[PDB]
Design a protein around this ligand. Structure first.
Ligand code: 5EN
Ligand code: ZN
Ligand code: ZN
Length: 296
């Protein structure tokens, strides 16, 4: 059978919150079968735990935030993307502050941590959510869709008209049958338009932002001296974001995601909309891995 997966060891890192700018301690720990991913604010007294589930998502305007009453864990999507890409079912995530460190702006550092911790197979069947019927959500010209697919595929299109984006592909369709999440998606950095970053900083926001953890573009060019890590790094980060946001389902997907100019808000709306309709999905396991449309 395809088994559930956790970490072999506890592993740690430090960084700053993109939004808050404050130093934060991060800890990844093994967890028992059927735990899922659980975030803990270990700085609080008592310590507050928030399961990484779609229903616990609060505001999504900037990043995906988990909320439990007045306690928040901000910017979970890049770390969760790495968890999803490496097929980590169960883990504890401890934080000394209200935001996951931005690190280098991608999922790369978290892939590195998870891999360094080691992967532990557990004696329980891994559950998958299989999309049975196409489900979609919209806001204006923005659209997020689940489509039936015998495997796991993420497709995305962005549609920026700014000169800096002219001629760029602005579209990618990743079938993970033949694409490595680690090598081809995970190191895609977050990006920001100079005007938008300036507006945030003017309000004492995005205090942790720098060229060392974000691609900065103005109307016409990429400001980072070393350019891009991937030729299509922009859309690949949108795909990265989607994979992380989607993992708040609590299980790996058998199906396709299609995003069109969408972000965290529509991603979460899509999840809640899917979950509510039980004719649109089912939970499956694989007693024989060779019969599975996916592989970890
Ligand atoms: C990409 C995104 O919008 C998505 F939701 F689509 C979203 N990204 C952000 O919202 C975002 C917010 C702020 C920054 C920034 C910065 C800076 C700087 C700076 C400081 C000093 C100097 N000299 C130069 C640069 C970058 C990204 C995202 O990835 N969420 O997961
Ligand atoms: Zn423009
Ligand atoms: Zn992102």
């Amino acid at each position: 059978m395809i088994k559930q997966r956790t970490l072999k060891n506890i592993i740690r890192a430090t960084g700053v919150g993109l939004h808050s700018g404050e130093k934060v301690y991060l800890t990844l720990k093994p967890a028992p079968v059927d735990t899922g991913i659980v975030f803990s604010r270990t700085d609080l007294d008592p310590v507050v735990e928030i399961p990484a589930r779609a229903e616990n998502v609060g505001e999504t305007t900037m990043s995906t935030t988990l909320v439990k009453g007045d306690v928040k864990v901000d910017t979970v999507e890049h770390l969760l993307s790495a968890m999803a890409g490496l097929g980590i079912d169960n883990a504890y995530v401890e934080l000394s502050a209200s935001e996951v460190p931005i690190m280098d702006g991608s999922a790369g550092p978290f892939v590195f941590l998870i891999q360094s911790a080691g992967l532990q197979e557990q004696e329980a069947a891994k559950k998958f959510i299989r999309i049975k019927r196409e489900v979609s959500v919209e806001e204006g010209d923005k659209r997020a869709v689940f489509v039936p697919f015998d495997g796991f595929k993420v497709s995305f299109e962005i549609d920026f008209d700014h000169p800096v984006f002219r001629g760029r592909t602005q579209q990618a369709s990743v079938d993970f049958s033949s694409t490595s999440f680690v090598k081809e998606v995970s190191r895609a950095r977050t990006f920001g338009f100079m005007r938008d970053i300036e507006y945030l900083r003017s309000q004492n926001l995005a205090l942790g932002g720098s060229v060392e953890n974000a691609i900065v573009v103005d109307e016409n060019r990429v400001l980072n001296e070393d350019g891009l890590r991937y030729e299509d790094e922009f859309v690949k980060h949108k795909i990265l974001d989607a994979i992380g946001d989607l993992y708040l389902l609590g299980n790996s997907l058998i199906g396709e995601f299609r995003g069109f100019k969408s972000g965290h808000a529509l991603n979460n709306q899509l999840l809640r909309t899917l979950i509510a309709d039980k004719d649109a999905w089912e939970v499956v396991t694989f007693e024989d891995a060779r019969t599975a449309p996916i592989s970890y």
